Amino acid sequence: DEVLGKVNGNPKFLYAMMEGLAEAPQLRLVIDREQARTLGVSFEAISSAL
Amino acid sequence: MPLFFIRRPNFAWVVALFISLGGLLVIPFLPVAQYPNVAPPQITVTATYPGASAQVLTDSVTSVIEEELNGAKNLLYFESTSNANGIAEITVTFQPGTDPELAQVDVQNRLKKAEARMPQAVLTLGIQTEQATAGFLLIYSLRYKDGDKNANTTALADYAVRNVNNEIRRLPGVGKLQFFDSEAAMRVWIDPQKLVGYGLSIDDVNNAIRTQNVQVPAGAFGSTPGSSEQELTATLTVKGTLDNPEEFAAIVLRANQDGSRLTLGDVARIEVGSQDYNFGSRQDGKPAVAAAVQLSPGANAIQTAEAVKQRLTELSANFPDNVEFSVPYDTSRFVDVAIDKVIMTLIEAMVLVFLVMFLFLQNVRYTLIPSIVVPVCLLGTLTFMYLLGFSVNMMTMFGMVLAIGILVDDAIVVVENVERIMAEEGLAPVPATIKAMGQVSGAIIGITLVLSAVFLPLAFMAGSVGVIYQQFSLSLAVSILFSGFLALTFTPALCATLLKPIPVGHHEKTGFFGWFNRKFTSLTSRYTKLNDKLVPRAGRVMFIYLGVVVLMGFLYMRLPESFVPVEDQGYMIVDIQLPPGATRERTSAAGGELESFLMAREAVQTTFLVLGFSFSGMGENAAIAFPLLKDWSERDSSQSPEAESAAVNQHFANLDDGAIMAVPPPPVEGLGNSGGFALRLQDRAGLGRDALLAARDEVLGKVNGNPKFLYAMMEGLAEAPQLRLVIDREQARTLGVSFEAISSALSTAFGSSVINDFANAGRQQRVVVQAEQAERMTPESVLRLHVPNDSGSLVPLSAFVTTSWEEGPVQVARYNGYPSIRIAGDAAPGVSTGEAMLELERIAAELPEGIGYEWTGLSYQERVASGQATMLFALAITVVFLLLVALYESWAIPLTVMLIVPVGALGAVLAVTAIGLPNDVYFKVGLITVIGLAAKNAILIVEFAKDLWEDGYSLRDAAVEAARLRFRPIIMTSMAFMLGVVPLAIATGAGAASQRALGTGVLGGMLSATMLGVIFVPIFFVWVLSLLRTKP
Amino acid sequence: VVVLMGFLYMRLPESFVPVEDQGYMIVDIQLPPGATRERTSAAGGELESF
Amino acid sequence: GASAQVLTDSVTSVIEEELNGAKNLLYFESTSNANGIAEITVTFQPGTDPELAQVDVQNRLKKAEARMPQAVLTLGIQTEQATAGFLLIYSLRYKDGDKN
Amino acid sequence: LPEGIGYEWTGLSYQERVASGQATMLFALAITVVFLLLVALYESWAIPL
């Protein structure tokens, strides 16, 4: 963003833009490994199922 | 053709300036290196089988790859060695001059064909093929300033891999970075006693690690094919792998419904450490790391070395303050010193030829011409050398320094002949040039062709000698080709242009110059009378000449042969081998004492020590040291590497823990681990390991007792006691114990098992599981291990395994597919290597039938060289004869001139025998260029002799006059070449052995070819034209 | 004349290769982060209609 | 189904790091997308035969193969020539223009 | 930019860089070679100038 602000505000170029995908919201899955294990759930089962 | 240029000087000027401009525009792409790829192209296979014995790895992995790599195009041989550390080494060697890329890809193709058979452990660890020998530019090292012993080399190695190695491998010119150490890895040090307490087996901990430390490709909700309604796809990014030891210690081994859990840390100590602990490196008593940087093909060395050093110093700014970098070894410093000295010799030889040029002609303008025509030839030499893809290495710089002499003669004779005509007839410069060049041009073409074809054959031979002679001879030949072209076209124009008229009759002179003119006139007249005195007695001079050729033969056959003189490379080899079964700590103590003593030696600037590696073989008992010597300028002869090696061997002769041996490095890199002879004792019939070792002691008894050899030792690891585990399979099974459980438990507890991938902040390293240091130090610890039965209890190992000791191979060596012993050594001082090879063949003939013997590397190439030299000489002689009969329109005149070369050979042989140097390659090429000069001399006499004797002069009068008017340039060029190559023979420092072997041989041979040739050649002329009764 | 030549030679903007009319164009369809394929298909539908 | 960062540090990182030092490299670009496709482009100096480039890159992918996940391996890694004299593109489409 | 952030050119920019680098001494070598051929042909220097 530093370089893009310094560039797009500079009239020496038509444009500058990330030829690349912008950051996106993600959904982290907080797996209590201990809780899942105590219920008898292997991490292998969760990983395979997901 | 020269007259064309005499009438049009600008044409010749432009052609010469053209070739010069080409030369100048070709240097910026010059490849430089120590030596060319003289060593054969070697590919080396590295297969890792953690915790597998030498024999297991031998018959499980390396045997299969060896089977697959047979019949590959361009094989020369292949060596394999399987060490107890679990690393297999297979070195496939090809004929020199074969492109290493094609060798590499073919070896990879055959490795793939083999890949289906190696165990899962090797495959998951990966098989690596690379190029063990190449232009390894340098080695750069990192070490701790404080010299703390407790320094964690793994943190240093991780810093080097993350920050340093990538930058250097990114640099231009470097074709491969060889990091010579391990990589970080979460270590899982399990305690089998805790596993016993918790009713857990090692497979349980492995499977917990395997399923709980796995990345999770969860995906993203709202993914294609998506509903026409939903519009918010997003990633699921589950965390699956573990980053730090704390997370790994939280791997749940067994959790109850109540809430109680068993985490990995409760049974194992978790830390980040080396993936592999086979090898350790030390630099000057401090734990250090190092990497081998190798030069890409067809690239400058000095520029690449400077780029690496500048990059590394720039990185040293971001370095941790406790760590410091240094570059102990650099192969570009030798080349920088070499070219800077050779340039100095070139300038100082130009000044010498200028000085004697002006001493003879006593006028600067006459002297100028060669000083301009010579570097033009040198620039053309560079352009053509680059065009064929040769490299600017020491051997081409000797091509330079001993070309300068044979090149300078063209200009010397041309300008000196034009002066002789200018003085004796006094014409204007142009018509005098016409006359002299008309006399000399056919002879000059004969020269150019005959020396072209005298070093053409030296370019035909194969082997490492093949490469040396290739470069050195072809540099010489291109030099003489352009020198002849200039003498035909450009230099005559130079005479027609730059020369100034002299007054008629101005032979009276003021000062010591007039003394010189008078004294040389007296010498020329005296020599004229001398010829007039011997030419009647030609049959009698036959007896002296035959004595000369017989003496040449006598000391030539009395001259010990050699491949290449050993050069002071500034480093030594010291081998650290302890008794069989030695732990790394004993080796570290031995290395500590060795490195301390090397500190006490002032001849050593820095000592680099390797633990676990030695050219004999890799193992815990084995280690190697590479002391670095100070620069030659800061050292004297008393601190030469050989003297320092003797000092160390005498010092550590009474070492109480193992053996320390100091061996000077082999002369040619990549042709072996030490100089001398390399012999593989095969068993072409399968007599068995014990029988092969029996033959080994047989041959070593028969050899070490023979005074023909300095020493001979098994370049390999001695047999070590082994602990065979007698597992009652039936008993273990009845208790409910599967063999799978025992095998898995042993492999994981003692051999360490790589479970899965540790995602260490972007690097995929491998979590390793191994038993605790205290729980695997003794044989009883093997018994204390437990394995699970079918009923869920844990069965101690000692319930069904009894340990019985026996003896086995810690290293197995195979050659061309058969089991072999690698025996190596050096001959006694003052004894030829060929005689030692013959003695070894004789002794090996006494071996029991079925035991084969095979030479390898240096010995094999010495063999092919000695084979090829003879018909090389023969082809050279027959071709020079044929060209001579072509040019001279006769047969008698060709034999007349060919009578000259024994005198040059005699001079070279007597000089080298007086100084005692062997019959190395450098002396051989010095001899051939001396022969070339003598042939040039002989033509320079005899073409004018023939010209006179076709003009009506009497045979004796024609010969004597020809010698009289060719005497001056003869001694002229002789003295120029003298003082041009005198620095070569007196050379000291880097590469000095090669330069001295040149200088002494060339100086002696050319000394005889002048002092004896100038007298004998007219005698030969009159004899041959008399006895054969030749007619004009 | 030679000075004039130099003066507008150094005043001449450099270029690699002039852009040729290749008969095709590039149009990029990038939606906000986390966009399902269906939104992109609707955008492409409107683009292709135009 | 592997995220951008997972594919980044699990597959494309290993191949990327291992292909360094290859003969005639001019640079190499890598991009890892959430779709689960890793994209690595290795560019060589013009005038080098792309047959030798292709074979060397395949030989290096071979050294990399030992580390990729089982999913990628069973699905397979593919190396080709993204830029070449692509003569044309030919297409098949439905006349009726049915969306379904 | 803050120290540690490196910049690099790729593809078209890299080629434009090397082209702009080579143009000058290419022109120079062309001029010197034509001069040399011209002095060869004309048996003079003044005529080549």
Ligand SMILES: c1ccc2c(CN3CCNCC3)cccc2c1
């Ligand atoms: C100092 C340190 C290493 C040196 C090497 C490396 N060696 C080959 C590869 N295996 C390790 C040993 C060769 C030659 C001179 C050296 C000098």
